[PDB]
């Protein structure tokens, strides 16, 4: 299942 | 020439909270001082949005959404226009944008990056198959996106994916979201390009 591919901390 | 000429457009997004960076993804300039972004950028929790160097806080912007049809109903592209009020031009590259999924799977695909976690970057991949509707990791989902066997990473988000109809290269949309050796992008329409630019 693909996820968001924005880069979040 | 058009893939150098798509990094050119390419700027690192940063998204800034209380003086530090808790989001880092991509921006394509499509024309005047419009980008292509990822939509999910606006529902994290900022108070600054870093656009290549320059910081901007929402009355500094519009984001205009793109609905797209699936399956009778309409629903929200992953795939947004940040057109800034006030900015440096960016050269017009919606000429190469096209209306259908003019592509074939198994056609060769480009992702342009530049981004504050890996610098510019290309990545390379094979053309799959389209998808009216992914369901994310998260439980969300995403209409409108075009599948690809490519190494993509968390930040590729907003990049511009190029593939190869006929002998002519042509920008498919933005990337969004990928995952175990699939990336998918979120699909934007040439038309759905040019009357956004009549309508800014």
């Given at each position: 299942?693909?996820?968001?591919?924005?880069?979040?901390? | 020439?058009?893939?150098?000429?798509?990094?050119?457009?390419?700027?690192?997004?940063?998204?800034?909270?209380?003086?530090?960076?808790?989001?880092?993804?991509?921006?394509?300039?499509?024309?005047?001082?419009?980008?292509?972004?990822?939509?999910?950028?606006?529902?994290?929790?900022?108070?600054?949005?870093?656009?290549?160097?320059?910081?901007?806080?929402?009355?500094?912007?519009?984001?205009?959404?793109?609905?797209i049809k699936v399956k009778?109903?309409?629903?929200?592209?992953?795939?947004?226009?940040?057109?800034?009020?006030?900015?440096?031009?960016?050269?017009?590259?919606?000429?190469?944008?096209?209306?259908?999924?003019?592509?074939?799977?198994?056609?060769?695909?480009?992702?342009?990056?530049?981004?504050?976690?890996?610098?510019?970057?290309?990545?390379?991949?094979?053309?799959?198959?389209?998808?009216?509707?992914?369901?994310?990791?998260?439980?969300?989902?995403?209409?409108?996106?075009?599948?690809?066997?490519?190494?993509?990473?968390?930040?590729?988000?907003?990049?511009?994916?190029?593939?190869?109809?006929?002998?002519?290269?042509?920008?498919?949309?933005?990337?969004?979201?990928?995952?175990?050796?699939?990336?998918?992008?979120?699909?934007?329409?040439?038309?759905?390009?040019?009357?956004?630019?009549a309508h800014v």
């Amino acid at each position: 299942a693909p996820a968001k591919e924005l880069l979040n901390f | 020439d058009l893939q150098k000429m798509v990094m050119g457009n390419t700027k690192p997004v940063e998204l800034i909270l209380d003086g530090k960076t808790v989001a880092i993804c991509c921006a394509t300039g499509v024309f005047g001082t419009a980008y292509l972004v990822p939509r999910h950028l606006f529902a994290e929790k900022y108070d600054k949005i870093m656009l290549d160097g320059r910081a901007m806080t929402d009355s500094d912007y519009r984001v205009f959404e793109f609905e797209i049809k699936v399956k009778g109903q309409d629903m929200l592209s992953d795939a947004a226009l940040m057109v800034l009020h006030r900015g440096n031009k960016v050269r017009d590259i919606t000429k190469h944008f096209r209306d259908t999924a003019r592509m074939k799977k198994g056609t060769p695909v480009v992702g342009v990056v530049n981004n504050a976690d890996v610098g510019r970057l290309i990545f390379s991949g094979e053309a799959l198959t389209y998808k009216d509707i992914v369901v994310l990791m998260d439980g969300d989902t995403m209409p409108g996106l075009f599948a690809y066997k490519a190494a993509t990473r968390a930040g590729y988000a907003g990049g511009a994916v190029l593939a190869k109809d006929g002998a002519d290269t042509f920008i498919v949309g933005t990337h969004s979201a990928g995952g175990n050796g699939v990336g998918y992008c979120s699909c934007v329409s040439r038309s759905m390009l040019q009357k956004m630019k009549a309508h800014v």
